[PDB]
Symmetry: D2
């Protein structure tokens, strides 16, 4: 089996852990965070939005036991000190939010891990992967890889279809986004100095910047710099929606053609629906993106057309499913 | 003073009432709704999002007393039965949500009112007004008028500036919107059969249609049919944001030009800000629209440009302020 | 199989429907509500707090099809007009909220149903059942029965233990409750004239009355009138907690004795836990009540003692699970 | 004028600032927090639950300017290094949450301030004051004082009236409380290791412990140890309610007597209402406690009585109002 260690047992870390239970041939042997065992175990068992963990979870001294299997747990802020070498870690899932750079994440390799997959956009000389859009870029000699962002994974399969079938001139994106752990409960100073992430998360529409906007150019090179846009963080705890408004090379495009193009591209990463669903309907789903055809709009004024589409995503579970597929693929190549 | 009656003492009706207290020369002499006096008075005094009513509110039998002034109240579902004639009502503010058609609203006139201002887009042969964008269209012979929607009021002053200064080819709109009373508390059947407004309002991002998309053509005729878009209803109780993505006639447009063009057009209906505010910051505001310059984007790929802008609005108080200005102007004619 | 018709395909009706799929020998053959098929089918498939319906749901003209089985649907406000006779309905689950009286609910019997089970406290000459507290009261000659309320079901098994083991002098109850469909979205006039249920449901702590307070006397006659209390409706969409503060007949009672007395009484209707859970953790659970031992308090001043306990409950699924057990028992006697 | 410095420009610190503008003879000359000027100024102007600041706020380098008045600002985690001596600070309002101990708070004195008022319960050899209940205990020689907690301020005036008028045997408290800055946005490890405050704040009913429970004994000595209870943190951002269930020395008490006893005691710290208000209705209020007579209950079984009362409080502004009155009183004596 492929020996996985999770750095940062947060939202993405814990769900990665859950999802790996469902997936044969991957084994989490260790976790690292900044807290005690009791906490880690508790937060795995109980999950506000994602539901109770099915299996049995028990605290031991090593760490904790999940359906009989032991999981070593550590409490070490500095990744280079982790005993990855001694536990023959194959791949670290880096989920702390503090190693989002190729050079930083190199700490895990020095500790003894063979590969690192970052659960976010990351700066530096590395590949950025959305599963089922560009994982084929991986030859297996990669040492550090980025799994991109939630939004990127919701967007890439939609943009690919538009660019391939109609030609993408330009587009602007808005993502209507669940609030996350880096927002504040009450209006208060923000670590990164963001005056908007500083505000009460569950009481506000909060404009913010998005990675996706340009992480996208790294995933689909031929549309590099053709897309931009931002986020609106709103008071749902998980579940999100990406709206995309574009100018295409083909005019005389119909709503019917756009939808059919999307359906024909659907797979396990990219779902298709015609049901009038809402955000809570996508909580826990494992498509990386779910095209909602009921939201497709074409605006035609004389010669010229504007096209609008929207895709749903569980920014937690949709991203996690995608990240684990990338993990499994990256591991099968070496 | 100008004799006002409010039909439907709901969210817009009660705030209209409050706003009128701030504004000289308008007097609410009557309200009509579907409940008792105690309830009406209570819901005026206490307000979840808009805060406590400052003055004194006391229930009497006529209805209730507000800072000494009596307000007659009625419990009559059929508008034509209201004693408008006997109380010399000058203008009815129609806020029930059930008379949003010129012919229907005519009931108030038969009851004896001299004019009706509908607090929503309304079908039929009437003018649709966003104050400080097209109120000048009113000549004072109008009998039934629409005050448009809250989204239309957030959008009209933004669209006018783009169309005037840059030439508007086409655009798509998304409004990120507070939930309203015509949504359900828990997933349940919806009166109008909307499978999305049926869902838990405070637990969901809920896609929906918008009036504004095309009430806009009635307010700014020269851009009729050049705009469309929809809503996303989200778990805030009030405060909203209109995002607009457009293709303009001028290319080589800058973020700086767009912003300055908006600032130059600001007045009491159309505010301008460069502060990184969030929705709760606009709760209670009396601008009909607040342009947020931090959100302006310009996307340039070779020859061709996409422009994005965004304006805040308290769907409750921004619209109410705008409706009352329109009321006051309509009355002065 | 036992032929069930659900009147009022609301929160309790739809979940009753879902729960019945899990339970052998009960078959829902009809539903009645005030809307079209597309709506009924849609609201069964998708559920904000309770999650997606697992099976397949397809709209036909009769009504709709669930995992192949047809379900006739009706749009008829007046219960006596329903074709219960023609479909040989054995038991109607009455969930509309508008037939909470023995005489009113008799309409279903005139329509042709054999028994009616009301999903609330109901006035009149009928028995009030909390499953595993007093279902043994049923001899099978009953024609109209009440399934009590969700708070009654969370409280009854707790009060029975206290009264049996310690003797109950008197007590006061507070339930910290999820908001329900009879509260308003925004401050607005309320149908029943309740000035507090009129207020924005998800932005307020809202004091209110509770049925439980005295539905309890009908379930456990020997403590009739010994209990009272009210509700605080708060901004969670489901999941609730009953706090109970009592004077007992034994003094020198210990935390340890109270807890153990509860654990010893636990069954499928009454769960026991020592985990520091929160409301969302009980969403979807099928215990009618979940005793939380971490919340047990005993206050002793000289001779005299006050005792405090707390039980969780998903006001939706906990009540539904209980109602369906009562349905199944009532049908086995019939 | 009395020279005030606010240590910790958070929820209580900023509201203290606002409230001081309304109150003659107190002048804030400095603030300390852990962030830049732009942030401080921004969060004073804009307030999610409390509304926009009325006056003008402008950033300068000293710090910021409020209605023309300069306010120096600092970025210094260690209190003993603040230039309190050089700015002749009379009183520091200590609102960080990190100096809640008489010995720790002594750092401000070494820095040069003349007195410290801690905006929370604080350990060590000091007085704990709820204004209009026990501020008369201050003789002016005090150097470090505690302003108690929000719950204590909501509860003291209610318990004093019950104990003076009926004799308090014993009682249990439940506070249904707004969520605060020390809870998490999403389920995540908690600094203090509280498995409950670790959970999503705006999606949960969260049981927790309360200071009040026994800060109370320090404020009303003669009922020391006669009260206990806890909190339920719920998804409102501000506004709270304290429920109290008590056994009194007088039996044959009536609802009418209890209510009248409270009204007769009302002042600027203790309000009285018979309106069916909800939590949002007390947001911004400056009573330290508002007795709600609609919620008064008396439970009588034969000889023996249980009594229940409830008082509202804006855990932010009610506490702040109370804190400032104590500030003003403390300053007038020294
Ligand atoms: N919707 C989403 O939450 C989402 C989606 C996709 C990607 N991501 C990315 O995933 C990453 C983690 O996000 P999250 O939401 O789980 O955050 P989180 O706060 O819930 O989890 C972060 C975890 O890391 C721990 N931690 C912090 N410093 C550490 C250290 N040096 N060593 C070990 N543990 C440390 C914290 O205890 C916490 O458990 C972020 O980069 C985020 O950008 C988030
Ligand atoms: N954000 C907003 O609330 C918003 C903004 C702009 C315009 N509007 C429009 O204003 C109208 C009402 O808005 P609202 O949100 O105040 O709704 P609301 O539910 O708060 O108010 C409707 C009120 O009228 C009463 N009523 C309903 N039908 C009646 C009848 N037949 N006869 C007498 N009284 C009746 C109701 O009891 C209620 O008080 C709608 O058309 C809406 O589109 C709403
Ligand atoms: N926490 C809870 O939701 C809960 C728990 C226990 C009991 N209950 C009780 O069960 C009953 C249903 O509660 P709910 O929360 O599901 O309500 P709900 O509003 O979600 O559903 C009521 C349904 O009945 C339908 N209906 C109303 N009148 C009808 C009529 N005359 N004919 C046919 N259909 C009609 C409505 O369309 C609606 O779909 C209520 O009495 C409630 O007290 C609710
Ligand atoms: N409902 C309430 O928020 C409430 C009510 C009464 C009392 N209190 C108490 O008041 C205190 C503050 O609570 P709050 O909710 O406003 O917290 P807050 O988080 O909103 O404010 C605390 C502030 O202190 C700053 N800070 C932290 N350490 C500092 C340091 N060493 N030097 C300078 N600044 C520092 C932080 O940046 C933050 O702005 C706590 O003890 C709290 O328990 C809170």
């Amino acid at each position: 089996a492929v020996k996985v260690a999770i750095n940062g047992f947060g939202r993405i870390g814990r769900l990665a852990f859950r999802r790996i239970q469902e997936v044969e041939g991957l084994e989490v042997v260790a976790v690292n965070d900044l807290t005690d065992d009791d906490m880690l175990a508790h937060l795995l068992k109980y999950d506000t939005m994602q539901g109770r963990f099915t299996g049995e979870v028990e605290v031991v001294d090593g760490g904790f036991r999940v359906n009989g299997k032991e999981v070593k747990s550590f409490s070490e802020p500095d990744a280079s000190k982790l005993p990855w070498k001694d536990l023959n870690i194959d791949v670290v899932l880096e989920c702390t939010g503090f190693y989002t750079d190729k050079d930083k994440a190199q700490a895990h390799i020095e500790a003894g891990a063979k590969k690192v997959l970052i659960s976010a956009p990351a700066t530096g000389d590395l590949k950025t992967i959305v599963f089922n859009t560009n994982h084929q870029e991986l030859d297996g000699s990669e040492t550090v890889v980025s799994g991109a962002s939630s939004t990127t994974n919701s967007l890439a399969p939609v943009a690919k279809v538009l660019n391939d079938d109609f030609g993408l001139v330009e587009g602007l994106m808005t993502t209507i986004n669940a609030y996350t752990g880096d927002q504040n409960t009450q209006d208060a100073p923000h670590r990164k100095g963001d005056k908007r992430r500083a505000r009460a998360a569950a009481e506000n529409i909060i404009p913010n910047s998005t990675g996706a906007a340009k992480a996208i150019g790294k995933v689909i090179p031929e549309i590099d710099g053709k897309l931009d846009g931002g986020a609106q963080r709103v008071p749902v705890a998980t579940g999100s929606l990406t709206e995309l408004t574009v100018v295409l090379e083909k005019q005389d495009v119909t709503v019917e053609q756009v939808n059919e193009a999307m359906k024909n591209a659907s797979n396990e990463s990219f779902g298709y629906t015609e049901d009038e669903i809402v955000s809570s309907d996508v909580v826990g789903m494992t498509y990386g993106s779910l095209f909602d055809a009921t939201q497709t709009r074409v605006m035609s004024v004389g010669d010229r057309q504007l096209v609008k589409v929207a895709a749903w995503y569980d920014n937690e579970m949709s991203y996690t499913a995608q990240l684990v597929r990338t993990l499994a693929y990256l591991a099968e190549l070496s």
